[PDB]
Amino acid sequence: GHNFERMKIKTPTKCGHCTSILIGLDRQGLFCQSCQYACHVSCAERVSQSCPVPIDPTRGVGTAYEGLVKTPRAGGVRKGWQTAYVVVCDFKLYLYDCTVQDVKNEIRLVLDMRDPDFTVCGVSEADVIHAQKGDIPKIFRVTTTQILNSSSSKFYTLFMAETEEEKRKWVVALSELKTLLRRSKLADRKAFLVKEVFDVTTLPSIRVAQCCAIIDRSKIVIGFSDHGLYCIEISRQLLIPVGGEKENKQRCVETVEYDEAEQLLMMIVGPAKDRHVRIVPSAALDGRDLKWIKVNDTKGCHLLAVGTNNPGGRAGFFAVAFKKSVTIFQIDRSEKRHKKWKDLAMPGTPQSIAIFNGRLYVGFSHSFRSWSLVGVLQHISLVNMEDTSLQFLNQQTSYEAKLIVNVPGSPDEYLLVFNMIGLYVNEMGRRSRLPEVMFPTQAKYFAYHEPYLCVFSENEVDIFNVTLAEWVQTINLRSAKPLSGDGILSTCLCNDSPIFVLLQNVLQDQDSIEVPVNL
């Protein structure tokens, strides 16, 4: 029988069992080597076991076309077209960079026909004012994600075919697939709608916003690069310096977390040369003069974590990360509202930090470790090196820890999210699911909003249901960047001007914040 091995796929490659491209940045499928068969880890279980072996409209799986097109360089048609490699797969368009002929297995753009606003058509000269006249009949335009409530509103991508005849082929072939998909009546698995909240006229300070957190439906706080922390009462349309104006003069607020049970705001403050942590009672949200409390000996910090799901709802901890150590601080009811609890030496430089369920979690390059904070000292790796299927992590030099998720619905299971993969382990540190979450493109940011992992890249946010280990949505946005720790409040460019968007969970019966209606 086959001798499968986890393989880094170097070029866009169809699964031998289902024909879908093996997307991802690392370990994208299994490869046999005895017979050269390549396939998804999840597909291997149904491949014939005899080794040299002799778009699906329902389930929505399969590669349909693999071709070359031209597409504008980053910046527009005025600067010229460049040859790219397009794959139509799983009712999606995969755009790849290429060089005439070396194609890497990194997608630069995904266009999902499951998008409510997917359309493809030709263009008039007014839609592409800069294309050469003789080129207009060769160009087609694909539309996807609409930004609701916007003040244009839709993500558009232009492709130029080699002939007008090939252009019409492209338009017709993508339309028939969209129509096939619509008729297939596949369940809607999308996670988010995108809603514009503020633009540069309603929030001119948007260009220097660095972070934000939700207080409740009616108000958020936003940290700015030079003006501190402000509380926005959205419906009242009011901008209130947290702790008063004196506290927010020439103050650089880089991150902000809100602890609702304890009524505390916790911040990484400062220009790089005096980065440190400050916390303040959220009574300060109303603009009263109230001095932000300095957390002593947090200079040079690079991460801050406030604990969630504290056991029994106790006040709990926050932790500050340094280059080779972490300090844990206990929240309390004294004047300072906190106290140093414990210094922890770290095996390497923390790359991610979190506290939840009474445990501290720190990620490094190729591991995560946890320290129990209840019953206290006791360090536990989340990867048991007696699991032969996990030993590959020690042999990695390029991995970076991003975040860890306790899987919703699987309390004894964790998703370890690296720059390259998402890996599932149980509480013993052994592998708990054979397939690994793949990301189509190199991520610029990761955020998590239960149960959705949100992976931000240049042209889209890709959404993963952590419970199902399923890629459920592609949200095309231009240079999206999360503002809140959980990403659902983000910024992005709309007609090259910055806007503030909410990623609204379509399963809720009300928006996460009150959205002002844009008319």
Interacting residue ranges for Zn ion, rule: CB under 5 A: 2, 15, 17-18, 32, 34-35, 37, 40, 43, 51
Cβ distance to Zn ion smaller for residue 17 or 138? 17
* Least gap, CB of 12 to Zn ion (angstroms): 14
* Least gap, CB of 28 to Zn ion (angstroms): 11
* Least gap, CB of 2 to Zn ion (angstroms): 4
211 annotated ligand binder: no
Cα-Cα-Cα-Cα torsion 123, 129, 134, 139, nearest 10 degrees, comes to -30
Residue type, 373: L
Cβ distance to Zn ion smaller for residue 21 or 355? 21
338 annotated ligand binder: no
Find all residues with CB under 8 Å of 108, minimum gap 6, and list them.
84, 95, 96, 97, 441, 458, 459
454 annotated ligand binder: no
* Least gap, CB of 472 to Zn ion (angstroms): 18
C-beta separation of 381 from 362 below 8 A: no
43 annotated ligand binder: yes
Cβ distance to Zn ion smaller for residue 35 or 283? 35
* Least gap, CB of 15 to Zn ion (angstroms): 3
* Least gap, CB of 54 to Zn ion (angstroms): 12
Cβ distance to Zn ion smaller for residue 47 or 77? 47
- Residues 65, 277: Cα–Cα separation, whole Å: 53
- Residues 223, 231: Cα–Cα separation, whole Å: 9
User: DSSP readout, 217-280?
Assistant: TTEEEEEETTBEEEEEETTTTEEEETT-TGGGTTB-EEEEEEETTTTEEEEEES-GGG-EEEEE
**Backbone phi, psi, residue 398, to 5°:** -105, -5
Query: Residue 236 to residues 223, 489, 516: CA-CA distances in angstroms?
Result: 19, 19, 10
- Residues 519, 516: Cα–Cα separation, whole Å: 9
Cβ distance to Zn ion smaller for residue 32 or 447? 32
Cβ distance to Zn ion smaller for residue 89 or 407? 89
15 annotated ligand binder: yes
Find all residues with CB under 8 Å of 176, minimum gap 6, and list them.
none
Please give the residue whose beta carbon sits closest to Zn ion in the complex. Answer: 15
Q: Residues for the chain: how many in total?
A: 519
**Known binding site for Zn(2+): residues?**
2, 15, 18, 32, 35, 40, 43, 51
